[PDB]
Scaffold this active site. Structure first.
Site, PDB file in Angstrom:
ATOM      1  N   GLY A 124     -81.858  50.789  51.533  1.00  0.00           N
ATOM      2  CA  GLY A 124     -80.576  50.294  51.084  1.00  0.00           C
ATOM      3  C   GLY A 124     -79.399  50.702  51.952  1.00  0.00           C
ATOM      4  O   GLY A 124     -79.536  51.346  52.991  1.00  0.00           O
TER       5      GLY A 124
ATOM      6  N   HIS B 254     -62.544  64.098  41.214  1.00  0.00           N
ATOM      7  CA  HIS B 254     -62.034  64.939  42.298  1.00  0.00           C
ATOM      8  C   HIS B 254     -60.743  65.672  41.920  1.00  0.00           C
ATOM      9  O   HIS B 254     -60.697  66.912  41.915  1.00  0.00           O
ATOM     10  CB  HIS B 254     -61.829  64.076  43.547  1.00  0.00           C
ATOM     11  CG  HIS B 254     -61.858  64.848  44.826  1.00  0.00           C
ATOM     12  ND1 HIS B 254     -60.785  64.897  45.690  1.00  0.00           N
ATOM     13  CD2 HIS B 254     -62.830  65.606  45.387  1.00  0.00           C
ATOM     14  CE1 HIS B 254     -61.096  65.651  46.729  1.00  0.00           C
ATOM     15  NE2 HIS B 254     -62.330  66.096  46.568  1.00  0.00           N
TER      16      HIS B 254
ATOM     17  N   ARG C 146     -44.608  53.524  47.089  1.00  0.00           N
ATOM     18  CA  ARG C 146     -45.059  54.795  46.541  1.00  0.00           C
ATOM     19  C   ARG C 146     -45.829  54.608  45.245  1.00  0.00           C
ATOM     20  O   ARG C 146     -46.519  55.534  44.809  1.00  0.00           O
ATOM     21  CB  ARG C 146     -43.882  55.732  46.288  1.00  0.00           C
ATOM     22  CG  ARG C 146     -43.069  56.064  47.510  1.00  0.00           C
ATOM     23  CD  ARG C 146     -42.090  57.186  47.212  1.00  0.00           C
ATOM     24  NE  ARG C 146     -42.763  58.465  46.983  1.00  0.00           N
ATOM     25  CZ  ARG C 146     -42.786  59.107  45.818  1.00  0.00           C
ATOM     26  NH1 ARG C 146     -42.174  58.600  44.757  1.00  0.00           N
ATOM     27  NH2 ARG C 146     -43.418  60.267  45.712  1.00  0.00           N
TER      28      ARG C 146
ATOM     29  N   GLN D 147     -54.482  68.829  56.006  1.00  0.00           N
ATOM     30  CA  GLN D 147     -54.004  67.978  57.085  1.00  0.00           C
ATOM     31  C   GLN D 147     -55.116  66.984  57.405  1.00  0.00           C
ATOM     32  O   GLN D 147     -56.084  67.355  58.082  1.00  0.00           O
ATOM     33  CB  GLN D 147     -53.668  68.810  58.325  1.00  0.00           C
ATOM     34  CG  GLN D 147     -52.773  70.037  58.114  1.00  0.00           C
ATOM     35  CD  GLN D 147     -51.317  69.710  57.852  1.00  0.00           C
ATOM     36  OE1 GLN D 147     -50.747  68.804  58.460  1.00  0.00           O
ATOM     37  NE2 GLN D 147     -50.689  70.495  56.986  1.00  0.00           N
TER      38      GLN D 147
ATOM     39  N   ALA E 158     -78.629  54.558  52.599  1.00  0.00           N
ATOM     40  CA  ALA E 158     -79.586  55.134  53.538  1.00  0.00           C
ATOM     41  C   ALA E 158     -79.370  54.591  54.946  1.00  0.00           C
ATOM     42  O   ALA E 158     -79.342  55.353  55.919  1.00  0.00           O
ATOM     43  CB  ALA E 158     -81.012  54.853  53.063  1.00  0.00           C
TER      44      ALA E 158
ATOM     45  N   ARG F 250     -51.723  62.236  40.123  1.00  0.00           N
ATOM     46  CA  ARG F 250     -51.135  61.004  40.636  1.00  0.00           C
ATOM     47  C   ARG F 250     -52.017  60.512  41.774  1.00  0.00           C
ATOM     48  O   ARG F 250     -52.245  61.247  42.743  1.00  0.00           O
ATOM     49  CB  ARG F 250     -49.705  61.254  41.124  1.00  0.00           C
ATOM     50  CG  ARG F 250     -48.946  60.031  41.621  1.00  0.00           C
ATOM     51  CD  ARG F 250     -47.790  60.475  42.511  1.00  0.00           C
ATOM     52  NE  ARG F 250     -47.075  59.383  43.170  1.00  0.00           N
ATOM     53  CZ  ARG F 250     -46.029  58.754  42.640  1.00  0.00           C
ATOM     54  NH1 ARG F 250     -45.572  59.113  41.447  1.00  0.00           N
ATOM     55  NH2 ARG F 250     -45.425  57.778  43.307  1.00  0.00           N
TER      56      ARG F 250
ATOM     57  N   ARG G 267     -89.568  49.885  47.592  1.00  0.00           N
ATOM     58  CA  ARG G 267     -90.479  48.783  47.284  1.00  0.00           C
ATOM     59  C   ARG G 267     -90.743  47.889  48.489  1.00  0.00           C
ATOM     60  O   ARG G 267     -91.863  47.387  48.647  1.00  0.00           O
ATOM     61  CB  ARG G 267     -89.933  47.916  46.146  1.00  0.00           C
ATOM     62  CG  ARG G 267     -89.694  48.597  44.813  1.00  0.00           C
ATOM     63  CD  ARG G 267     -88.939  47.630  43.907  1.00  0.00           C
ATOM     64  NE  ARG G 267     -87.665  47.217  44.489  1.00  0.00           N
ATOM     65  CZ  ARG G 267     -86.851  46.318  43.945  1.00  0.00           C
ATOM     66  NH1 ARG G 267     -87.179  45.725  42.806  1.00  0.00           N
ATOM     67  NH2 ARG G 267     -85.713  46.001  44.547  1.00  0.00           N
TER      68      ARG G 267
ATOM     69  N   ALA H 162     -84.916  54.086  50.514  1.00  0.00           N
ATOM     70  CA  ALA H 162     -84.533  54.216  51.913  1.00  0.00           C
ATOM     71  C   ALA H 162     -84.119  52.899  52.556  1.00  0.00           C
ATOM     72  O   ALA H 162     -83.521  52.921  53.637  1.00  0.00           O
ATOM     73  CB  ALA H 162     -85.685  54.836  52.707  1.00  0.00           C
TER      74      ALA H 162
ATOM     75  N   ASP I 128     -62.620  56.465  39.820  1.00  0.00           N
ATOM     76  CA  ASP I 128     -62.925  56.559  41.244  1.00  0.00           C
ATOM     77  C   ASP I 128     -62.453  57.877  41.844  1.00  0.00           C
ATOM     78  O   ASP I 128     -63.174  58.492  42.638  1.00  0.00           O
ATOM     79  CB  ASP I 128     -62.297  55.381  41.991  1.00  0.00           C
ATOM     80  CG  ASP I 128     -62.846  55.221  43.395  1.00  0.00           C
ATOM     81  OD1 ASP I 128     -64.075  55.357  43.579  1.00  0.00           O
ATOM     82  OD2 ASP I 128     -62.048  54.946  44.311  1.00  0.00           O
TER      83      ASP I 128
HETATM   84  N1  LIG Z   1     -68.225  55.236  46.107  1.00  0.00           N
HETATM   85  C1  LIG Z   1     -69.358  55.201  45.399  1.00  0.00           C
HETATM   86  O1  LIG Z   1     -69.409  55.479  44.190  1.00  0.00           O
HETATM   87  C2  LIG Z   1     -70.611  54.815  46.107  1.00  0.00           C
HETATM   88  C3  LIG Z   1     -70.614  54.220  47.388  1.00  0.00           C
HETATM   89  C4  LIG Z   1     -71.832  53.897  47.973  1.00  0.00           C
HETATM   90  C5  LIG Z   1     -73.018  54.149  47.304  1.00  0.00           C
HETATM   91  N2  LIG Z   1     -72.968  54.731  46.037  1.00  0.00           N
HETATM   92  C6  LIG Z   1     -74.211  55.028  45.273  1.00  0.00           C
HETATM   93  O2  LIG Z   1     -75.260  55.205  46.189  1.00  0.00           O
HETATM   94  C7  LIG Z   1     -76.486  54.855  45.528  1.00  0.00           C
HETATM   95  C8  LIG Z   1     -77.279  53.982  46.469  1.00  0.00           C
HETATM   96  O3  LIG Z   1     -76.564  52.746  46.615  1.00  0.00           O
HETATM   97  P1  LIG Z   1     -76.693  51.808  47.883  1.00  0.00           P
HETATM   98  O4  LIG Z   1     -75.376  51.857  48.596  1.00  0.00           O
HETATM   99  O5  LIG Z   1     -77.825  52.310  48.719  1.00  0.00           O
HETATM  100  O6  LIG Z   1     -77.034  50.363  47.331  1.00  0.00           O
HETATM  101  P2  LIG Z   1     -78.421  49.551  47.073  1.00  0.00           P
HETATM  102  O7  LIG Z   1     -78.737  48.689  48.263  1.00  0.00           O
HETATM  103  O8  LIG Z   1     -78.153  48.766  45.839  1.00  0.00           O
HETATM  104  O9  LIG Z   1     -79.710  50.418  46.727  1.00  0.00           O
HETATM  105  C9  LIG Z   1     -80.597  50.794  47.716  1.00  0.00           C
HETATM  106  C10 LIG Z   1     -81.977  50.313  47.374  1.00  0.00           C
HETATM  107  O10 LIG Z   1     -82.091  50.321  45.931  1.00  0.00           O
HETATM  108  C11 LIG Z   1     -83.108  49.404  45.558  1.00  0.00           C
HETATM  109  N3  LIG Z   1     -82.543  48.674  44.402  1.00  0.00           N
HETATM  110  C12 LIG Z   1     -81.223  48.188  44.248  1.00  0.00           C
HETATM  111  N4  LIG Z   1     -81.019  47.591  43.052  1.00  0.00           N
HETATM  112  C13 LIG Z   1     -82.254  47.706  42.395  1.00  0.00           C
HETATM  113  C14 LIG Z   1     -82.713  47.297  41.135  1.00  0.00           C
HETATM  114  N5  LIG Z   1     -81.880  46.634  40.250  1.00  0.00           N
HETATM  115  N6  LIG Z   1     -84.002  47.555  40.766  1.00  0.00           N
HETATM  116  C15 LIG Z   1     -84.771  48.197  41.641  1.00  0.00           C
HETATM  117  N7  LIG Z   1     -84.486  48.643  42.851  1.00  0.00           N
HETATM  118  C16 LIG Z   1     -83.206  48.383  43.217  1.00  0.00           C
HETATM  119  C17 LIG Z   1     -83.455  48.540  46.845  1.00  0.00           C
HETATM  120  O11 LIG Z   1     -84.686  48.995  47.450  1.00  0.00           O
HETATM  121  P3  LIG Z   1     -85.951  48.039  47.516  1.00  0.00           P
HETATM  122  O12 LIG Z   1     -85.558  46.591  47.380  1.00  0.00           O
HETATM  123  O13 LIG Z   1     -86.782  48.308  48.769  1.00  0.00           O
HETATM  124  O14 LIG Z   1     -86.689  48.491  46.257  1.00  0.00           O
HETATM  125  C18 LIG Z   1     -82.234  48.835  47.720  1.00  0.00           C
HETATM  126  O15 LIG Z   1     -82.546  48.714  49.111  1.00  0.00           O
HETATM  127  C19 LIG Z   1     -76.092  54.173  44.188  1.00  0.00           C
HETATM  128  O16 LIG Z   1     -76.317  55.022  43.122  1.00  0.00           O
HETATM  129  C20 LIG Z   1     -74.593  53.868  44.384  1.00  0.00           C
HETATM  130  O17 LIG Z   1     -73.827  54.001  43.230  1.00  0.00           O
HETATM  131  C21 LIG Z   1     -71.798  55.059  45.454  1.00  0.00           C
END
Ligand SMILES: NC(=O)c1ccc[n+]([C@@H]2O[C@H](COP(=O)([O-])OP(=O)(O)OC[C@H]3O[C@@H](n4cnc5c(N)ncnc54)[C@H](OP(=O)(O)O)[C@@H]3O)[C@@H](O)[C@H]2O)c1
Ligand SMILES: NC(=O)c1ccc[n+]([C@@H]2O[C@H](COP(=O)([O-])OP(=O)(O)OC[C@H]3O[C@@H](n4cnc5c(N)ncnc54)[C@H](OP(=O)(O)O)[C@@H]3O)[C@@H](O)[C@H]2O)c1
Lengths: 433, 433
Positions: A14, A236, A417, A360, A17, A330, A45, A12, A231
């Site tokens: 990160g 998608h 394009r 749209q 969240a 594409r 944590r 929560a 991506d």
């Molecule tokens: N377009 C996309 O693909 C996209 C975009 C955004 C997010 N996401 C996904 O969303 C998920 C959450 O990502 P996020 O945006 O919230 O980033 P994040 O800040 O890296 O992760 C959120 C929390 O994860 C914990 N954490 C991060 N790295 C860690 C590690 N190596 N070991 C242990 N705990 C770790 C930390 O909590 P604590 O320090 O309190 O433990 C951090 O506050 C991920 O799976 C990410 O791929 C994907």
């Protein structure tokens, strides 16, 4: 299954969240769209309090001064537990805290794994033994990346599904637009309408397009480790190819329509490089703004990266309904428009004709409707384990070839394009049989 | 049938010949689209020379200085005969003049009746006995109005067709836009594609729209003697209703597709006033230009005319394919846009979905392609005698009721979408069966 739901935001503290999860659950609670007896429990944590999360997250709530009473109630239903992600006693503290809440023994439990999948293996294990509910249902939301190729994705997915039935696994994907679910909704409705017309007989060529007008914008660093195929295309565009080519589902169960999607995927063989045009966007000289900067000109991109920011790919569904009918995927960033269409070209007996389907770019948006689906249990707009496996099978040989040979992508100017070689490739597959 | 064609412009002195006929045949000759051995013979009472016609008509040719050699050749193939329209000796002079031309005995003869239909009865008679070719084909182009109701149209049409086979009668209609034939072309192609989908089963409502943004503009005088039903609906909108509802033709013969159109018309019963909303456009106060003037504010309009300049009508095709499916014909002048679309609304199992077909308003334009069709003998985009009779049967009771009761049309401001009563009428026929 009852009236009491516990929304557990694993990780929560990160970015996801802070900026997205907490705000959208606030909006769903505010608009009266959550179950009345819902509790929200952050788990991570770093030693925080509900006050800390509010401090760092309410800025994104767009909270108005006449909403402060529902907002105080919302944070009154909020609670936070610190713990490690592979520590038994930590999950014990979490589970007993949840049991302490009103009707929590009973309660439905919805785990949002807002965490890097690198820790997924631990989390899903500990939850499975410590925090699942004995009466209410248990539903886990897993987040991208769902692995990066067939092997890694199979490892992560076999782990997750050896602990949870597939009607408990919700693979969420929501970063492409607020209008993102309406796309698949209208493509399902359109397959239901135009089924008897969509043949090899009437259709000669099917193109699916995802253009975005903006670049990576100061975040090319994250993008560079995945690529435009991972991506946008492998997840998608491929699902909407499925929704176009699928047969009439047995019903409108989530699982009959997903069965038809997977039946489509199991007849697309693996895409090969000659049917692929990769491109990378360069800065616009005469333009201005983020357009003067190119892809490599983003500071977060490793020097000399050959990562494609544009891809044009040709697939073929190989059954009696579609054969030698080319499906052209594409997509790319930093293009001319923000288009998201599907074209179907016809066989004339006349120039040449073509049916177009555009979103749209019903008041709940994409991600909002997705969280409501996990609440309601509607697994339709989530990818199934076999669907995911088949997508990765289709695209892994190509991605491996790219990562090995580092093929220098074709440069295209910010706002173009795309490469003219993509139009070349489209022109090339005029099959005519 | 050979190589020599004689284009006889009956009534060559008039507005249609001066401003449109002579210029477009000049363009077809210039672009190399006429038969190589073509002669042009104007015929009319006023004593003119080829030089006079050139004087009064070349202004409209858009003749450039590098086109002067083909233009001199063009007027060298031109000739003019004065005569009366019911004078035997006059048609004798015309016929023998044509016989004098190179290969004229032999030659194909194409009579353009650029005349008020009030004289048609005479002209078609005299031609029939005096000027038809014995070897080449004979084709008459008749012009609007094709009568003004079922009775008058039957009189004129029975006269014309008691002298000429239907493959000699070309009823031309071309005053609505340069893109006017492409409309029917794409609707034919679309009926061929979507045939298996266009049912009472999938479609709930079909609306066909012809909006124009300009008023009558200093010519409301001519319009006032006909009405928006006779101007746009009874002829054009009705044919594209036909092209939407028709069955698969036996082939692509002009006559199989026209047979299917008439089969459609013979199952539409007569439209009644309760299913009709008439409107008349008034001046825009805050606008400017021709928008400050309304309909009645046009000097050429008789004072207090109740002539509708906007009409919304509901028809029903009554067979097994279409039943209780409402076809909404909506058209009018001085509206918001210049739209020419066809919408088909569907039956959901969800909001509500709908397929759209628009002509964005092959290089030969509408009227040009029509003259080339009469040369090639392609009768497809011309209305047949029975097609015309059925259209007039559908609309004559209503037109008679209007002319009798002078129902005061509903006023709408120049630039509006039209009367809101039209939207009311659309909302009213939500049939739901
Ligand atoms: N377009 C996309 O693909 C996209 C975009 C955004 C997010 N996401 C996904 O969303 C998920 C959450 O990502 P996020 O945006 O919230 O980033 P994040 O800040 O890296 O992760 C959120 C929390 O994860 C914990 N954490 C991060 N790295 C860690 C590690 N190596 N070991 C242990 N705990 C770790 C930390 O909590 P604590 O320090 O309190 O433990 C951090 O506050 C991920 O799976 C990410 O791929 C994907
Ligand atoms: N939107 C439409 O429906 C539309 C628009 C334009 C034209 N048209 C049709 O096009 C046809 C030709 O019309 P136009 O534009 O060329 O107008 P026009 O000037 O009235 O007719 C052309 C020639 O007809 C002769 N004429 C006219 N009235 C006559 C009468 N009462 N008795 C004998 N001869 C007469 C005159 O030739 P002489 O004096 O040398 O004999 C005149 O130069 C008509 O059928 C008209 O309805 C329709």
């Amino acid at each position: 299954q009852s009236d009491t739901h516990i929304f557990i935001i694993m990780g929560a503290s990160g970015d996801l969240a802070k900026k997205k999860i907490y705000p959208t659950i606030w909006w769903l609670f505010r608009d009266g769209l959550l179950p009345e007896n819902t509790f929200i429990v952050g788990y991570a944590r770093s030693r925080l309090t509900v006050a800390d999360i509010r401090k760092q997250s309410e800025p994104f709530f767009k909270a108005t001064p006449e909403e402060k009473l529902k907002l105080e109630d919302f944070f009154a239903r909020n609670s936070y537990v610190a713990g490690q992600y592979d520590d038994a006693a930590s999950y014990q503290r979490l589970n007993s805290h949840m049991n302490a809440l009103h009707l929590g023994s009973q309660a439905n439990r919805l785990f949002y794994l807002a965490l890097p999948p690198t820790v997924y293996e631990a989390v899903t294990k500990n939850i499975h033994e410590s925090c699942m509910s004995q009466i209410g249902w248990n539903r886990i939301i897993v987040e991208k990346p769902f692995g990066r190729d067939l092997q890694s994705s199979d490892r992560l997915s076999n782990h997750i599904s050896s602990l949870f039935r597939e009607d408990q696994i919700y693979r969420i994907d929501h970063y492409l637009g607020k209008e993102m679910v309406q796309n698949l909704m209208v493509l399902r409705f359109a397959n239901r309408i135009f089924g008897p017309i969509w043949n090899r007989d009437n259709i000669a060529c099917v193109i699916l397009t995802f253009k975005e007008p903006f670049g990576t914008e100061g975040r090319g660093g994250y993008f560079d480790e995945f690529g435009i195929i991972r991506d946008v295309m492998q997840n998608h565009l491929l699902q909407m190819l499925c929704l176009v080519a699928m047969e009439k589902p047995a019903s409108t169960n989530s699982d009959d329509v997903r069965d038809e999607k997977v039946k489509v995927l199991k007849c697309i063989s693996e895409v090969q490089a000659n049917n692929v045009v990769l491109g990378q966007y360069v800065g616009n000289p005469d333009g201005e703004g983020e357009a003067t900067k190119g892809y490599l000109d983003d500071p977060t991109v490793p020097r000399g990266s050959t990562t494609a920011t544009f891809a044009a790919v040709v697939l073929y569904v190989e059954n009696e309904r579609w054969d030698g009918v080319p499906f052209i995927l594409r997509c790319g960033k930093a293009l001319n428009e923000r288009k998201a269409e599907v074209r179907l070209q016809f066989h004339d007996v006349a120039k040449r004709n073509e049916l177009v389907i555009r979103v749209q770019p019903k008041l709940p948006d994409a991600y909002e409707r997705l969280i409501l689906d996990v609440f309601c249990g509607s697994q339709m707009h989530f990818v199934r384990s076999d669907e995911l496996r088949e997508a990765w099978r289709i695209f892994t040989p190509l991605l491996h070839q790219i990562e090995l040979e580092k093929p220098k992508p074709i440069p295209y100017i910010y706002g173009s394009r795309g490469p003219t070689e993509a139009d070349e490739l489209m022109k090339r597959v005029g099959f005519q049989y």
